[PDB]
Design a protein around this ligand. Structure first.
Ligand code: CA
Lengths: 1137, 153
């Protein structure tokens, strides 16, 4: 369309702009923007300023340049120019800058400075293909929208639910009373949620210290306003720190079932994020469903073919057979290094000079490899060097042929890198690894866009949070954007989803606490990882494609007895009986009574089962049984149960549950997913080996770089972990009038890198994405041997954690993809009347003009629920009563209206109506309960009043249907869930005594006690969530004294009552991991294996609309031609749609 | 290089020998070759093969004119043809250039046409000397096991 327009000089200047150079200029000056701003962030702290103070003009420089390009834009296409997206955003940013400094000139506030950070996107704006990338990412968001709302729906539904019971608890959380030693009773009148702390007391005063707040000291999380509940629901959805919400609420009445709420919430948020993964993978299958070098190799190899005293060495270029045998010998040489990489490393703090003469052996292996590279040099001279790998290995062996020089011990540490040469083996696996690395070339651009998002978000963050940064009292503050790298590590922090929470509660707390403008700051985090993790989720699809591209590439009488069906029936009654008995034994106290009859029962079942093994054994088993899983399972059932209680621990009663487990084999549905799993582990075992080898690599890295470190003192004020001795002040809060002595120092830092085994230890913890930044930070306090400190010493070390984490972002992410592909092939394997006045009222109601009306009524009820502020004092409460009365009357009235219809079918027919009837019932009942108020359960009834919202979902057509897909999906996978229970149900009991009697205290073991079985179910449930388990693990290595009221032991105490048992948690995380993997594949096969196809159909065909066409078919009969004529109108209408 | 491998490996067994006569020529005016390779000399070389094979030693001919397996089809010799494959003509282009190329292309493309299942017993498509020599050597060891049953001695 353009505007105004003019010839003359304008066309010439535009022709100049049609050239080339200007592009590079604008781009590079944008780069100048990026750099200058990245510096500009350093620092801030309100006023002061330093070097940036001159840059302050320079942004005006960029301004005027860009503005000159705007003068060029005048020559562009005006209104026609607006149509371009990149040009649109560019013009936008231009307006932000013009308005920016244009406001600034009058100033001769900080929001303008925030608007400064908009610039970097222009870097994308100048770059081709990134537009293709982002145009791709936008497409991804659509086939997800429903579920997002569903999340929001839960986020609302739970909120309103939280806006009841938890709002009823909002009456609790907002207040407290207490005194004396922090021993006030929990959850029994006059009780309250406590601040975390290593002690907790909260001076207020309120007698001797108060005792309960969490709306601000814990930060916002309080359920009072609907908004804050929406917040706490976000973080609880994040599967991060939420359990603290639980122990808080539970601290104050009570252990009823808050857990039902948090468990349903966790499990569902889980369910549907898994569904998100399903949507993404569905996009993968969508693109791939239609989507589904030898020449040069022949060239190089045949040139090598024609290519074919020193001449004896030329004979040695091919000779001889020994060169094969020598490879076996070579396996020894690297093996000597395989220990040496540890042996030169082991131990730590100068302990054990294991490399007493190992250096000579290193010189010897260096001599052998040098002899090999030398003979290879004799083999073909320069042609041997033509291959880069040969000269590389030769340069490595020569590097080992060097010397102790020099001062950079990391060069000595490169010997660990020399160990990589041992990875040369493993035939064909390297090719698969090449297939893996090949994907990186594809995903790298998107990774760069991720780097960009990281960049903009980081800078803006720096100019926001760190743009104030300051927070008087009282450490550790951790990362808080005080400097650009700091913001890097912290953005990357919350990006992991690790403990972002505390960051955020430094965030809102930074702006003077919650109010009205400051709380808005929260939005950033909500903008952030919710999109940021989303960006990560987006990354999956890339791999999802690339990886699939690779995929695209008179004994007879007893025989009558055991085989008898009646014997199996007595075995069935025995099954129900033994199950009832073991379930009776599920409580810890059951053994205290007469459990012996149950032992006789389990003995009978073990007898019949071992007899079944005896029956199968006589019929061509043995070696077949050695091959077959089942008969081997029964024979192993025979031998393992026979293991003595003496010598190596065992407990036969725990095996009593196992005897009926064989019946699970009779189910076939589990066998498909299971066969899929056994097919899966074989499919990607090499990757697992690669990961473990990475564990070795980073192990060797950390050990010969950190071993002297971490032997921390208290605090930094001691440095030398030997200079440490005696007491040490601790000032509570900040005031230098509240001293408390402590026999402090030293500290083992929980996870030494003194040992490569310990390296496997801690490195696994960071592998969990759980608790690492603490380890990171203290790693940054490192220096020399026995010393910590300080602040931000040795920042370069921080680079390392990230690097490894980045690799975790690869293969782990690959792992989950792998399963899916087999399943995708597995799915392919799976593919292999009315009358009188009633006639009048029915006509009026059936018209469903009321539908929009009733809908509006419901939404207004929603807003009435939004009214729920529990500040002070009354007035509005009575109004709320009146409102609830209003809606309940309107609704019950409406149900009466519907009652005035089919009646015999209106009371049922279509099921939701019945549900509505339920609603009316609970509504009226609760109302009467309100009348009787002139009682605690009435809250649980008001829940029913909240349940009305679901009716909105009833109106949510082409959305609830997806939930119906979830419903049809729901059944088949449930069989696995029993094992999902059983995996706990075993280990819990298996732990229930072992880790039992660990004493309640205040460690990681208080309201989170291991005591009764159900609580054990919880403490093993946290581990499922990746919720700070390692601390709990740390508690269990030696623990405390008994339950400090139990049988204890004797005079013995001294926390001696617990001992090493890392294996339990460690193994359990993995078992839980694999079991959950099974949960993935189960959900997938039972749903998206159909449901993704359902997305493909609903997005294109009309299989779903056809049901609506049948609904049109309802308004008819059953023939004949007259029915065809009456339906001809609706038919002629339908086909157009 | 191939005969070098076959010789140093199959030492004491293999009996490689050159054949100046064109054995493919071997099968009331008497037949006579118009070629310098007289048919009677060919008969003499065939008898030399009949004598050389009598010792039950391995034999690997180095015939010059036999560019294609089909030529030996009429022979009573029943040769063990070997096929040193180069599937890509461009590769052999660059090979011969790396040191008459066009007729070499028609010939190599011709040998590419042939049915591997019958026309050839072994395909030396391997690029490196080591693996290809391992294959052909394992093959000749297989034939060696085939021709020498334990009962014979
Ligand atoms: Ca976590």
């Amino acid at each position: 369309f353009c505007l105004t327009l003019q010839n003359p000089l304008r066309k010439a200047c535009i022709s100049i702009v049609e050239w080339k150079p200007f592009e590079t200029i604008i781009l590079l000056t944008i780069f100048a923007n990026c750099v200058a701003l990245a510096v500009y962030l350093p620092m801030p702290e309100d006023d002061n300023n330093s070097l940036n103070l001159g840059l302050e003009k320079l942004e005006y420089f960029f301004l005027t340049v860009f503005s000159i390009e705007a003068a060029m834009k005048i020559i562009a296409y005006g209104f026609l120019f607006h149509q371009d997206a990149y040009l649109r955003s560019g013009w936008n940013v231009l307006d932000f800058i013009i308005v920016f400094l244009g406001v600034f000139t009058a100033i001769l506030v900080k929001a303008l400075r925030a608007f400064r950070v908009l610039r970097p996107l222009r870097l994308v704006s100048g770059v081709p293909s990134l537009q293709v990338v982002l145009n791709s990412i936008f497409k991804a968001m659509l086939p997800l929208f429903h579920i997002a709302l569903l999340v929001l729906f839960m986020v609302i539904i739970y909120a309103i639910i939280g806006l009841e019971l938890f709002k009823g608890k909002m009456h609790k959380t907002c207040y407290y009373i207490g005194t004396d030693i922090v021993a006030t009773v929990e959850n029994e009148k006059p009780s309250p949620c406590a601040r975390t702390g290593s002690g907790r007391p909260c001076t207020i005063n309120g007698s001797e210290c108060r005792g309960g707040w969490p709306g601000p000291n814990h930060g916002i999380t309080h359920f009072d306003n609907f908004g804050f509940s929406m917040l706490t629901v976000y973080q609880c959805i994040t599967m991060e720190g939420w359990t603290d919400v639980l122990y808080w609420v539970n601290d104050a009445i009570g252990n009823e079932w808050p857990w039902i709420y948090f468990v349903t919430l966790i499990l569902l948020g889980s369910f549907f994020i898994l569904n998100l993964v399903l949507g993404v993978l569905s996009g993968e299958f969508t693109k791939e469903r239609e989507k589904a070098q030898q020449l040069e190799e022949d060239l190089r190899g045949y040139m090598s073919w024609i290519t074919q005293c020193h001449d004896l060495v030329k004979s040695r270029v091919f000779y001889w057979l020994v060169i094969l045998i020598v490879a076996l010998n070579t396996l020894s040489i690297a093996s000597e290094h395989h220990n040496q990489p540890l042996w030169l490393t082991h131990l730590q703090d100068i302990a054990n000079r294991v490399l007493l003469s190992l250096f000579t052996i290193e010189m010897l292996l260096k001599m052998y490899g040098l002899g090999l590279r030398q003979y290879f040099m004799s083999i073909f001279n320069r042609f041997d060097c033509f291959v880069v790998c040969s000269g590389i290995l030769e340069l490595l062996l020569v590097e080992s042929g060097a010397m102790t020089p020099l001062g950079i011990s990391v060069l000595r540490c490169i010997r660990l890198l020399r160990l990589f040469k041992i990875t040369k083996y493993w035939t064909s696996l390297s090719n698969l690894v090449a297939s893996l690395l090949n994907s990186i070339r594809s995903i790298a651009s998107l990774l760069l866009l991720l780097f960009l998002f990281i960049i903009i978000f980081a800078l803006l963050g720096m100019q926001l949070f760190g743009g104030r940064y300051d927070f008087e009292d009282t450490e550790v503050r951790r990362s808080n954007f005080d400097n650009f790298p700091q913001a890097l590590i912290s953005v990357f922090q919350v990006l992991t989803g690790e403990d972002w929470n505390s960051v955020m509660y430094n965030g809102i707390m930074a702006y003077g606490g919650p109010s009205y403008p400051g709380v808005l700051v929260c939005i950033y985090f909500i903008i952030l990882f919710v999109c940021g993790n989303y960006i990560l989720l987006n990354v999956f699809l890339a791999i999802a494609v690339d990886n699939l591209a690779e995929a695209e590439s008179a004994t007879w009488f007893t025989n009558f007895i055991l085989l008898f069906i009646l014997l199996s029936s007595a075995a069935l009654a025995a099954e129900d009986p033994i199950r009832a008995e073991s379930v009776r034994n599920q409580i810890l106290g059951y053994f205290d009574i007469a459990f012996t009859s149950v032992f006789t029962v389990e003995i009978v079942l073990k007898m019949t089962t071992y007899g079944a093994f005896l029956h199968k054994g006589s019929f061509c088993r043995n070696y077949f049984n050695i091959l077959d899983l089942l008969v081997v399972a029964v024979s192993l059932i025979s031998m393992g149960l026979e293991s003595s209680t003496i010598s190596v621990v065992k407990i036969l009663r725990v095996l009593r549950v196992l005897r009926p487990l064989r019946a699970i084999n009779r189910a076939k549905g589990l066998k498909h997913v299971v066969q899929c799993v056994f097919v899966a582990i074989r499919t990607i075992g090499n990757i697992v080996l690669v990961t473990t080898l990475l564990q070795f690599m980073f192990a060797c890295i950390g050990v010969q770089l950190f071993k002297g470190k971490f032997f921390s003192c208290n605090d930094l004020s001691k440095m030398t972990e030997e200079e440490c001795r005696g007491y040490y002040y601790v000032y509570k809060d900040g005031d230098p009038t509240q001293m408390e002595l402590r026999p402090r120092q030293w500290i083992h830092n929980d996870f030494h890198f003194d040992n490569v085994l310990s390296a496997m230890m801690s490195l696994f913890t960071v592998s969990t994405f759980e608790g690492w930044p603490q380890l990171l930070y203290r790693a940054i306090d490192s220096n020399e041997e026995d010393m910590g400190p300080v602040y931000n010493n040795r920042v370069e070390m921080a680079i390392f954690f990230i690097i490894y984490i980045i690799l975790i972002a690869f293969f782990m992410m690959n792992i989950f993809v792998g399963f899916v592909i087999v399943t995708f092939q597995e799915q392919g394997e799976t593919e292999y009347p009315k009358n009188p006045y009633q006639y009048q009222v029915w006509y009026v109601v059936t018209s469903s003009y009321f539908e929009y009306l009733m809908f509006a009524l419901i939404m207004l009820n929603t807003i009435c629920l939004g009214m729920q502020h529990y500040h002070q004092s009354e007035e509005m409460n009575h109004i709320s009563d009146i409102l609830n009365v209003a809606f309940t009357i309107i609704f019950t009235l409406e149900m009466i209206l519907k009652l005035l219809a089919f009646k015999a079918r209106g009371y049922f027919g279509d099921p939701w109506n019945v549900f509505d009837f339920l609603i009316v019932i609970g509504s009226i009942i609760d109302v009467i309960l309100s009348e009787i108020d002139t009682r605690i359960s009435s809250a649980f009834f008001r829940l029913f009043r909240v349940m009305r919202l679901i009716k909105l979902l009833s109106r949510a057509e082409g959305v609830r249907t997806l939930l119906w897909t979830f419903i049809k999906s729901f059944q088949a996978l449930p069989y696995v869930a029993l094992l999902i229970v059983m995996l706990f149900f075993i280990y819990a009991v298996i732990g229930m005594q072992m880790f039992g009697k660990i004493a309640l205290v205040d460690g990681t073991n208080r309201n989170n006690n291991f005591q009764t079985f159900p609580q054990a179910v919880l403490l093993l449930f946290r581990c499922a969530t990746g919720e700070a388990w390692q601390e709990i693990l740390l508690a269990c290595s030696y623990g405390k004294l008994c339950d400090p009221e139990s049988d204890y032991a004797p005079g013995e105490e001294y926390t001696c009552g617990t001992n090493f048992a890392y294996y339990y948690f460690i193994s359990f995380y993995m078992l839980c991991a694999f079991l959950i993997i099974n949960l993935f594949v189960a959900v997938i096969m039972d749903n998206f294996d159909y449901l993704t196809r359902d997305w493909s159909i609903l997005g294109x065909x009309x299989x779903x609309x056809x049901x609506x066409x049948x609904x049109x078919x309802x308004x008819x009969x059953x023939x004949x031609x007259x029915x065809x004529x009456x339906x001809x109108x609706x038919x002629x209408x339908x086909x157009x749609x | 290089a191939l005969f070098d491998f076959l010789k140093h490996r199959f030492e004491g067994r293999i009996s490689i020998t050159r054949v100046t006569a064109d054995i493919s020529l071997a099968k009331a005016i008497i037949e006579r070759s118009n070629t310098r390779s007289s048919l009677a000399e060919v008969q003499s070389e065939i008898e030399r093969i009949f004598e050389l094979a009598r010792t039950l030693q391995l034999v690997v001919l180095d015939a010059d004119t036999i560019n294609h397996p089909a030529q030996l089809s009429k022979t009573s010799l029943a040769p063990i043809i070997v096929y040193v494959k180069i599937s890509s003509p461009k590769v052999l282009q660059r090979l011969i250039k790396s040191r008459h190329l066009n007729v070499q292309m028609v010939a190599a493309d011709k040998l590419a046409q042939c049915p591997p299942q019958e026309s050839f017993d072994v395909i030396l498509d391997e690029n490196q000397l080591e693996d290809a020599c391992e294959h052909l050597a394992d093959y000749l060891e297989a034939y060696w096991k085939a021709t020498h049953p334990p009962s014979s001695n």
